[PDB]
Point group: C3
């Protein structure tokens, strides 16, 4: 009965190997990619009482800078506005050259960062320091006084709405972020929590940043970067109703570096009294990147046949190894 016992042991080993191969979903299921489309819709307000008077309100279309969605969008969090900018010869900015007596600066564009077409003169900047005279946007920026109170910190309570639609080809199955569990009644009193309500897509910017690993009120002065990822891991063997996304906010938390924080200049032009003016904002804001990836598969007979053939081959190899070790 030694031979029968050995044959039974080999058969059991082969069965276990086949079960392991069919486990982990390594085989018997196809692999397909996905195509995605993401839209965002922020909703909030912000008071902007400024010592320069003229209170202003930043609406939904005033801080979302792409203003129409896109994967990578920026939400304004702070700014240094220099209104009523016009073209004309006047004093330059410091850290770009110091004028001693009509000799420090020579006519021509300066190397690397430039502020205007230098003409050559010692025009008294109203900071006890005399600099060069340039031809450009006359009221130059003053970015030293970054606003500590975080003028638009009230963005902590904004509600981001990530509407995601995907399609798996080769199965022609299309799904959306709004899973049939979430209905209209769950969109008026809905927030997002990773354990309590993991399906409703109405996130809160404060909460998103908090789960990003970045403390708020310190990246508001100089906007950081936040990355949201919507993993779509689904199996088409079961009903399509079991296709749900997983949100993971891998926030690249640094809070201290050589050049920390996002920052960009943007200007809006207009015409007043027949002269072209310009409003320039140095906006610091938090940029959200919404990366979408996934993999789904279903029953196909070719991968099943290939896996069964590989299982037969590895079972034969195992029997060869067992015979070899028994020979020794």
């Amino acid at each position: 009965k030694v031979g029968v016992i050995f044959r039974l042991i080999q058969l059991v080993v082969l069965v276990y190997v086949i079960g392991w191969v069919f486990l982990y979903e390594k085989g018997y299921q196809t692999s397909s990619g996905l195509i995605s489309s993401v839209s965002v819709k922020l909703k909030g307000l912000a008071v902007t009482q400024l010592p320069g008077l003229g209170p202003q309100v930043w609406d939904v279309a005033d801080y979302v800078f792409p203003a129409q969605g896109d994967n990578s969008f920026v939400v304004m969090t702070n700014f240094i506005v220099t209104p009523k900018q016009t073209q004309g010869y006047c004093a330059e900015h410091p850290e770009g050259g110091i004028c001693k007596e009509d000799s420090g600066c020579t006519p021509g564009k300066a190397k690397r960062k430039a502020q205007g077409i230098r003409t050559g003169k010692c025009v008294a900047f109203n900071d006890t320091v005399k600099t060069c005279e340039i031809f450009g946007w006359c009221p130059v920026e003053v970015d030293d006084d970054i606003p500590r109170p975080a003028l638009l910190r009230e963005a902590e309570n904004f509600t981001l709405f990530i509407k995601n639609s995907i399609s798996f080809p080769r199965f022609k199955v299309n799904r959306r972020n709004l899973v049939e569990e979430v209905n209209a009644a769950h969109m008026k009193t809905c927030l997002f929590h990773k354990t309590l309500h993991p399906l409703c897509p109405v996130f809160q910017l404060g909460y998103v940043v908090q789960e990003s690993g970045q403390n708020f009120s310190t990246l508001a002065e100089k906007g950081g970067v936040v990355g949201i990822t919507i993993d779509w891991h689904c199996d088409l063997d079961w009903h399509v109703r079991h296709c749900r996304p997983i949100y993971e906010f891998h926030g690249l938390y640094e809070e201290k570096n050589l050049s920390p924080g996002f920052n960009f200049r943007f200007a809006r032009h207009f015409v007043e009294n027949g002269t072209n003016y310009r409003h320039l904002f140095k906006v610091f804001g938090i940029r959200f990147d919404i990366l979408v990836d996934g993999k789904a598969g279903k029953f196909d007979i070719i991968p099943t046949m290939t896996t069964i053939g590989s299982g037969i081959g590895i079972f034969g190899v195992a029997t060869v190894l067992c015979d070899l070790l028994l020979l020794h």
Copy 2:
């Protein structure tokens, strides 16, 4: 000798199957691509304000540079001449009833103003609250059934895709199918008749998506174009022509249909800051590409020849075991 001949035949058949089915004698590469989109059309809106505007190439393609994913106007409800002031809040904020209903502070979820607290009348019979902000004129829910900025189904998209193929250092472009010189003045895109001209039509990009354009422009929608470059790159230099498959990317109807956003353009009239606010129900086009390619390399050929010889040995072992 019969068994040896059968084993040799099985081995050579396996080798041929490995070489010709999965194409194991060639390597693989990724894809780096750039997409440039240039719409060209016109649409006129006879708004009831006696202000007939003309919307041209720079007025409805919202990302003017034409990114990979962009948006085309198909409907709007303009709310012009907006300044900063106090007036009645939109009724979704609440209902006034008594003067004590309104409270100071912003709203909870969707704030429209500071809500200082008063009971001004928004309509002739409905009073909500008093808010300070972009107050004078507020956006409403009056989506135009005739679908203003219609006839967007006659525009001509133009995808000037480019391909890199870094490892093989072979550069290909969508525009040049090695024959395109006068097929650009008068061409369309048909999946069977003219599958090479990249001057699409928004009628022939939504229709093959499986969604009718009659209800797509009312509340917006999403359309996806793939342009996947599946080129053999081995027995040719040309024959890298891409294939297009406009994916449906979800059907219409259902909860929260379509896709609409809001944007605004500021201006100065009499020393007071103003704002033109548009709510846009525009289609969204996404262009995401992929490719594999492949070229003759000796290392993968040797690796798969070794794998084939191993498979042949395993098959011979299995046959010998079965015979015994």
Copy 3:
């Protein structure tokens, strides 16, 4: 004999496992990466223009997606057609030719439309004429592309790239600014493929457009440049030895039916009581910044399964050698 054959088989197996360990990196768990970029351009250009009014294009005046978005256009040429307004005016000599008053009909001219045609014939220029259209009145004339390239001083703009990537499976975060690069280097650093390969890629037109392309003709009519950032590093060593490599692509140079890349964009304003717009046909450079990478760590499951595969391949090699010896016996 038998001992020699066993030693040869053991040596072959050892070589096989060494090859599969030091070539395919079997004891590693390859994973993707997530990424974000923040592109900041610095520079200044001045245009005279035949309008007798000098213009200065500032930091936020040429780069249009003025927040990054890893796909942006740095304007290098334009054809300004200012002071446009709604009215009935003549059409461009590309949608039709006005032989007489009956040569044009109301409609949108099918493919390419510049205005709602009315039918009347109005003289334009001197001989060509045209059909009247209701729309933006002064039609654009893009026939005369400026050869001196106007905003041609783009061979000195700096392109500070602030790339931050994260590998989630190992939960590691890295940035473009390698710890070696500090504030003392950012004051004056220029990216070079051999001498300074770590500080972010600067100076469009000198070490960015030198990808088998020439700024001379890549700014007169626009063009496309692709910067790919590869993060190929392993967390087996210290995290310090994880630095990216930049490669600039040469997608095409010239000799094409539709070369370059240009787009029309309009800036609106209101004067007196009428809405006007400035229309720019911007010819620019599209910089596609694409970042990819891969990383792995030593884990027990991959090394166990690769040692099992090595044992299997050693056994199959042994039985193949035995069969060969039997056939050659």
